[PDB]
């Protein structure tokens, strides 16, 4: 049975080799499988997609030297059954869905011992990939135009995104071996550069899937990530430089802290059209229009503040002691009593919670900025400024640590966010009212591991650095083989 | 020497799984394709149904 199956596709692969594949003979070719009941069924497509497969792996195998000729063949009829097949309204979705599946549940079926090779299948998927690249070609001209066309418009965006969904199945966390063959399609030239260039951001939601599992397998097999993991996030840097920018948040969060230097480069990402003043030259950032401008944020990070939203709010409007309080309270019930860790990290200070906490604060200074006159939102006894000041001096060692981590990142390029939190750490380095070498210390600390790792230094940090020597108020803090940099820079 | 059960055996039937998941008829675009054409073309094909 299974063997007349194999003769069809014995047929097809004769047929496109040693012919041009923009012939309309092979659209006539699968106009003639359902002719017969090969393709009658869909029960029979999935299956007649599944024997065609092991196949091209079998024909793999064997192989002295680049035998694709076979898998190649699949790869195009994968896409002239998605554009030569009339689809109803939800079935195209469920289409491109089913064969997706099939091909992962072969892999599984390949990884699983009964001379695995992760090359054939990566050959699939790219040309998949450029097949469809090559349709999707200026708003889908190529195809008829009878407005078959706008179905397929409304399916691009459908597509990449389910395409990614499938492409999560096999991270590396899942297949060790495919590993750095899941890297190198991540970063397909026709994958990564279109999605993040997809009509606003639509996209961004599934890139950030990929990159997630990405940082979770970095918390060996892990070089060949980590190497791969950093031209991309360069790259990005290059190409769309806001994707770093905006989901940075939903970024930092997942990102391991011994990290460093990809830490920067996601922060010291700048917008394309931009250029910024030399930030080791010598103040009033008033007079620059730039800062002004507000951090666009993709993801709000009030929805993973749950049910603070209230209490901080209420807060940000009132600073009530009272209020303080209660929220002191449920950040030491989320570290102590529930929500308890294991092994290294243990007993965790809630990163992504403080993270989030510091973001709203700022989020809300911001709007408070463009309204309102702006003179207020600087100050020593301004609320967005008193919640972050008493946070610290009311919170534990590891709880200040995370509070002082999270507003040293939020100083990236030049907006109301570097201008705002930077005033913050200025100030409250230079604060009285505390019971103070502790605090310095983290200040120091947090803001000195942003710098010593290699280039590019971001330039939030590199004014803050600069304008400290400058403010006059260096060594004389006691604490400083710290002092070894005080001579590098 | 494991009977029936192995983790290729498993897959093997999900594939089937997947393959009787909303049973559908593939309906060809009969609009496209100049048809009475398609009538002159060869078999094309070497095929037994049953």
């Known amino acids: ?489 | 020497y494991d009977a029936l059960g192995n983790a290729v055996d498993f897959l093997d039937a999900r594939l089937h799984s997947l393959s009787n998941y909303q049973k559908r008829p593939i309906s060809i675009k009969s609009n496209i394709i100049d048809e009475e054409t398609y009538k002159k073309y060869p078999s094309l094909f070497s095929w037994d149904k049953i």
């Not at chain 1, 024909?59 to 000729?69: A, G, Q, R």
């Not at chain 1, 407005?147 to 499938?166: A, K, M, P």
């Not at chain 1, 996030?233 to 769309?240: E, P, R, V, Y």
Request: hydrophobic content about 45%; charged content about 20%; glycine content about 2%.
């Open chain 1, 1 to 489: 049975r299974t063997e007349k199956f194999y003769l069809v596709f014995t047929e097809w692969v004769k047929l496109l080799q040693r012919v041009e594949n923009n012939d309309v003979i092979t659209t006539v070719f699968i106009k003639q499988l359902v002719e017969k009941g090969v393709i009658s069924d869909t029960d029979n497509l999935l299956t007649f997609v599944k024997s065609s497969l092991e196949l091209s792996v079998s024909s793999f195998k064997e192989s002295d030297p680049e035998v694709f000729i076979a898998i190649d063949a699949l790869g195009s009829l994968i896409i002239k059954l998605l554009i030569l097949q009339d689809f109803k309204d939800d079935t195209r979705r469920d289409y491109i869905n089913a064969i997706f599946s099939v091909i992962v549940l072969v892999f599984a079926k390949d990884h699983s011992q009964e001379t695995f090779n992760e090359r054939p299948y990566f050959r699939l998927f790219s040309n998949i990939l450029y097949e469809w690249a090559t349709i999707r070609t200026h708003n889908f001209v190529r195809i008829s135009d009878s407005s078959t066309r706008q179905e397929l418009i409304e399916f691009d965006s459908v597509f990449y995104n389910t395409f990614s969904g499938y492409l999560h199945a096999l991270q590396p966390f899942a297949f060790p071996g495919f590993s750095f063959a899941w890297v190198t399609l991540l970063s397909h030239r026709m994958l990564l550069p279109i999605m993040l260039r997809l009509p606003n951001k639509i996209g961004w939601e599934k890139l950030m899937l990929l990159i997630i599992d990405l940082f979770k397998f970095l918390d060996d097999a892990v070089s060949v990530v980590y190497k791969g993991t950093l031209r991309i996030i360069l790259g990005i840097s290059n190409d769309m430089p806001s994707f770093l920018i905006e989901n940075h948040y939903e970024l930092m969060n997942n990102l391991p802290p011994t990290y460093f230097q990809l830490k920067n480069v996601i922060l010291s990402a700048i917008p394309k059209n931009m250029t910024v003043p030399n930030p080791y030259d010598v103040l009033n950032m008033e007079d620059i229009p730039a800062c002004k401008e507000l951090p666009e944020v993709f993801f709000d990070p009030v929805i993973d503040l749950h049910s603070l939203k209230k209490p901080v709010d209420n807060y940000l409007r009132i600073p009530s002691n009272s209020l303080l309080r209660t929220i002191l309270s449920a950040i030491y019930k989320d570290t102590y009593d529930i929500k308890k860790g294991v092994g290294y990290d243990f007993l965790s200070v809630d990163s992504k919670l403080i993270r989030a906490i510091v973001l709203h604060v700022g989020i809300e200074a911001g709007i408070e900025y463009k309204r309102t006159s702006s003179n207020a939102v600087f100050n020593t006894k301004s609320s967005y400024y008193t919640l972050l000041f008493n946070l610290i001096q009311n919170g534990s060692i590891e709880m200040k640590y995370q509070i002082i981590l999270s507003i040293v990142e939020q100083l990236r390029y030049p907006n109301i966010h570097t201008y705002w939190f930077s005033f913050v750490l200025m100030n409250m380095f230079k604060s009285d009212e505390w019971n103070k070498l502790e605090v310095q210390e983290i200040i120091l600390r947090n803001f000195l591991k942003r710098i010593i790792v290699n280039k590019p230094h971001t330039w939030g940090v590199s004014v803050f650095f600069t304008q400290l020597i400058n403010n006059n108020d260096l060594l004389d803090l006691p604490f400083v083989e710290i002092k070894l940099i005080l001579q590098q820079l």
